[PDB]
Amino acid sequence: MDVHIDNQVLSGLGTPLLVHLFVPDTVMAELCPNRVPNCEGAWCQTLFSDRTGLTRVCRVFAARGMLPGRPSHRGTFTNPFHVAALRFYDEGGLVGELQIYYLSLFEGAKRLVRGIAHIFSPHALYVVTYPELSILGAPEREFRFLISVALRISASFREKLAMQAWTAQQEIPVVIPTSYSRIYKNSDLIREAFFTVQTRVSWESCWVKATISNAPKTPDACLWIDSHPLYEEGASAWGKVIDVALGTDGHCVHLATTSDGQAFLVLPGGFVIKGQLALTPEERGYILARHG
Amino acid sequence: SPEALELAEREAERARSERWDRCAQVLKNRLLRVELDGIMRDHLARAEEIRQDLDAVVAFSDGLESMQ
Amino acid sequence: SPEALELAEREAERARSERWDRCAQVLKNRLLRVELDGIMRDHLARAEEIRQDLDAVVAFSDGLESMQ
Amino acid sequence: SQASRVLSRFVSQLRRKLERSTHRLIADLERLKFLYL
C-alpha cells in the first residue's frame, strides 16, 4: 500500500478524486498475454460518458505484491455509468487498455479490501478503501467510430477497383506458384479479405497510429502495417512499423497505411490495391485526444 | 468480380450485428445479476434497521414501568 | 508445398465457416420482467398482512389492561 | 400516562419504517424495469 501514500502528496495535481485499486494477474492476462511484465510505466487515463474527455493524469506507478490476505495468490498491486479507462505499460512496448464501469467502484467501496464483479471480463477485482480517509451507448461509441472509419476505407478501395476496370496488378515482386486455377478460389481471396478487414476493430490499428505522426519528415518515409490470418487461423497483430516478406507468406491479409492518407491492401501473392483515407477534423481530434 | 463485393459487405454486416446482439445479452445478464445482489444487500440493510428499531421498542418497553 | 498449404487453408475455412451461426431471443426479458411484478404483488400482500397484525397489537395491548 | 407515551410512539416508528421497504421496492424494481431493459 506504499504507492498510495506515494501518490497523495502530488496526487492532487491532475485529478480531484481517485480510487485505489488492485488488479489480479488473471485479469491482466487479458492485457499482456504470454508475459508477466512489471507496471512501473503504467499510466492511467480518465473517461466520461459524453463527448468531453480528459486524460493523462498518470495516477500510479505500482509494483506487484501479494494481497494482505494469505489466500490472495500473486496479483498486481496498485452518474454511475461510464467506461473508465486505464492504460498499463512497461519500459518496453507492452501496452494494454482495461475498462472499468461504475457501480463497481462506488458499490465496490462497501464496508479494508473487497472483491467486486468485473463486467467487461468475467473475474473479480479488488478495491481497497482507506478507513481514515443511455447505458449501452457509453461502451458502444468507440466500436461504431472505428467500424464506420474502416467502412469508409473499404468504400475507397471499392471505388479504386472501379477505376481500374475491375482488374488488379502487382506492386510487390513475389513470384506466385502460377498454379492458381481457382485453387484457393481467387475470388474467395478478396471475399475473405474484405470479411476480415470490415469485421476486425481495434483501437491500435494501423491507420490509428498513422493518423498521428510526430514529424513531417520521418513519417513520409514510414509505413504502418498490420497483417492478420486468413479465416481466423490465429490472433491479429496491429501497428507494426516499416523503417517484402508480407507479400510472400500466404493466408495473411496485409493492410499498410501511410501518414499521407494512403491505404494499401496486400493479398497473398503480392497484389496491391490502393485506397484513400479521409477523416473529418472532429474524428481526427477525438483520435488525437485518445492516442495523444 | 463486382458481385462478391456486396456479398462480403452484407456478410460483414450480419457478423457485426450478431456479435453485438450477443455481447448485449451477456452484459445485460451480468448487470441484472449484479443489480439483484445490490437489491438484496439493500433489503437486508433495511430489514436490519427494522430489527434495530423494533428492538429499541423492546428495550424502552423494558423501562416503561421505570418511567411511570 | 502448395498442396498441403491449400488443404490446411481449406480446413481452417471449414472451421471458421461453421463457427458462424448465432441466434437471438426476446421473450425471456418479458418473462423476467413479469417475474418482478409477481414478486412485488406478493411482497406487498405480506407487508399489509404484517402491518395489520402490528395494528391489532395495539388493541390487544390496551385491551388486556381491563383484564387487570 | 406512560403507556400512552410508548404504545403509540413506537407503533408510529414501526409503521413509517414498514412503509420504507415498500417505498424502496417500488423505486428499485422500476429502476430495473427502465435502466437494464
Add this chain to the structure above:
Amino acid sequence: SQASRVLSRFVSQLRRKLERSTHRLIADLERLKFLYL
C-alpha cells in the same frame, strides 16, 4: 403481571414475522437466478 406477558409475547410475534421476509427474499432471489439465470 401483565407487562411480562405483553412486552414479551408481542415482541416474539413481531420478530418471528421479521424473519419470514428475509427467508422469502432468500428463496425468491435464488429461484430467480436458478430459473432464469
Add this chain to the structure above:
Amino acid sequence: DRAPQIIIGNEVYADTLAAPQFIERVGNMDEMAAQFVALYGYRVNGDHDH
C-alpha cells in the same frame, strides 16, 4: 491454494460466492419430494442446450 477455475460449458466459475449461480443442490429423495413437479416441468419444458 492454487487459484482454480471451473469452466462449465461456456461459462467460467471462480468463487464459492458464485456457488448459488453455477451449481445445483439435489437433496435426498426423502427431502426432495416437495419440488418434483417443478423438476419435471423443467425436464420437459426446459432448454437444456443453454
Add this chain to the structure above:
Amino acid sequence: MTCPTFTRAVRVSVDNDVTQQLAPNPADKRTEQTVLVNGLVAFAFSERTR
C-alpha cells in the same frame, strides 16, 4: 423422481505447483482436465447389444 438430466462435461483448470511455476507465459503454468458429470465409464459393447 430425482433422476438427473443429461450427462455433461466440465473442464477444470488449476495452476501448477509453486515448485513448477517458473515459466515466462502465464498460460503454460496451468494444467486442465475434464470431468464427466452424471455419466459413467464403460467397457466395450457387443454388436447386438449396441
Add this chain to the structure above:
Amino acid sequence: PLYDIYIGRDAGERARHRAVHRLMVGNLPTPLAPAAFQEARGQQFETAT
C-alpha cells in the same frame, strides 16, 4: 527433461515455441526410459515402503 517443447503455426507474427511441464515421472518418452525401467522402479518403490 522437465519440459515438453513444441512449436505452434505462425499467424500475424513469427511463432514462438511453447513449453509444458511434464508434471510427472511417467511422462518421459519411452526412448529415454523404456517400460521395463518403470516396472523395475515400481518394484523398487514397493520394496522401499
Add this chain to the structure above:
Amino acid sequence: MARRLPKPTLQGRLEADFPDSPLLPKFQELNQNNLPNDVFREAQRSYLVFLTSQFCYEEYVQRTFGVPRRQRAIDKR
C-alpha cells in the same frame, strides 16, 4: 435439442386400451390445444411416465415404514 438418441421401441395405445387405472382421472387434465398429434402423444407419454414414478415412490415409502408392534400384540385376540 440439437440432436437426441432415437426413440426407444415401445408398444402403442397403452394408456387407453389395456387399463383403467386410478392414474387416468388425474392424467386427463392435460390438453393438446396447440401441439400436433405426434408431439402431443410424446408429451402425454412422458407425463404418464412421471405419474407412474410418483405412484411407485409413494407406495414404496409405505412399504418401507415397517411392521407395527401393536398389530402383533393383537395376534392373540
